[PDB]
Curated annotation (Swiss-Prot):
Subunit details: Binds constitutively to TP53BP1. Binds CDC27, which is itself a component of the anaphase promoting complex (APC). Binds PIAS1.
Mutagenesis or variant effect for residue 139 to N: Impaired nuclear focus formation, reduced interaction with PIAS and increased sensitivity to cisplatin
Biological function: May be required for DNA interstrand cross-link repair. Also required for checkpoint mediated cell cycle arrest in early prophase in response to mitotic spindle poisons. Possesses beta-lactamase activity, catalyzing the hydrolysis of penicillin G and nitrocefin. Exhibits no activity towards other beta-lactam antibiotic classes including cephalosporins (cefotaxime) and carbapenems (imipenem).
Up-regulation conditions: During mitosis. The mRNA encoding this protein contains an internal ribosome entry site (IRES) in its 5'-UTR. This 5'-UTR generally suppresses translation while specifically promoting expression during mitosis, when cap-dependent translation may be impaired.
Organism phylogeny: Eukaryota, Metazoa, Chordata, Craniata, Vertebrata
Name this protein carries in UniProt: DNA cross-link repair 1A protein
Intracellular or extracellular location(s): Nucleus
Amino acid sequence: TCPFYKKIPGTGFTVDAFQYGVVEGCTAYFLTHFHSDHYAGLSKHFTFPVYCSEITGNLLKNKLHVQEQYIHPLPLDTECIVNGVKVVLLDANHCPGAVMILFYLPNGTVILHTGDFRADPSMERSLLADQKVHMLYLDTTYCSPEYTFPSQQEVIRFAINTAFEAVTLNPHALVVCGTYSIGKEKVFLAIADVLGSKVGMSQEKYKTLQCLNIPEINSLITTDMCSSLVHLLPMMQINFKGLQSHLKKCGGKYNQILAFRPTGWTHSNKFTRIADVIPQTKGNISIYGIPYSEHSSYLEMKRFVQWLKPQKIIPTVNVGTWKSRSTMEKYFREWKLEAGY
Ligand code: NI
């Protein structure tokens, strides 16, 4: 059944709750972002109102074929009324079109639902600075102190310098980048930019990217593989067998692959710095795992929550085990006692 952490009390609203059939007493289904664990269950047959960002609304229409009459896009940073309740959508610093949602309940309670987010100090100067938030529905993906990772900026610098050096040393090297969802577009766009190439990809993935309102996108991507030296492939194909195979397909235009796998966290983060990352190499193929995260580190999550000072925290991630639930609740109490709220 729909879990309680997907329901907004004092409303008929649900968040990211499309796989339970008709949720009894739901008058509006919000969708925070276009990732499959969140939209799971949506299709052209859905006939309830969906509230989301403009970009998520483009993807619902073009990729899932949801009918336009049920898609209700809202602008960001704007007070809007939905079924008699004031809401605001805020940028979540996750993937394109990802939002956090502020609900102002008739009884005076204010609730923030982060969806998936990467906390940032810039959020401390949004519409959130303007009033008290009583309840926080929190993306707790990396809620443990082992989870450190570099800034997105540091990671992109590493990737750009690595690719540029490799291709300048060997003009017949191909760069390949993996993907299995929207998000992390900076990785392949930054590398293609330094190399003066467009990124080449399948027709399905090109269609997906043309929904994202990225400025000058027609100048940056293409379905012509032969004219491009940065290819995108399914994350599943980013391994020695899949890459050798791919190389055969390019008809001796290339004699070396340098490949990037943008992971979330991996245990080499507890020891190694970004400056010291090395690839896995077999023959003329090398694969770099780079820690490009679109979720908060433990320290970023802690700073956000200690700034916000919520009265109650409801985790939305890692809720399935008693040991995870108990560990998270211990950190929430530490944070509250350290900061004095
Ligand atoms: Ni997500």
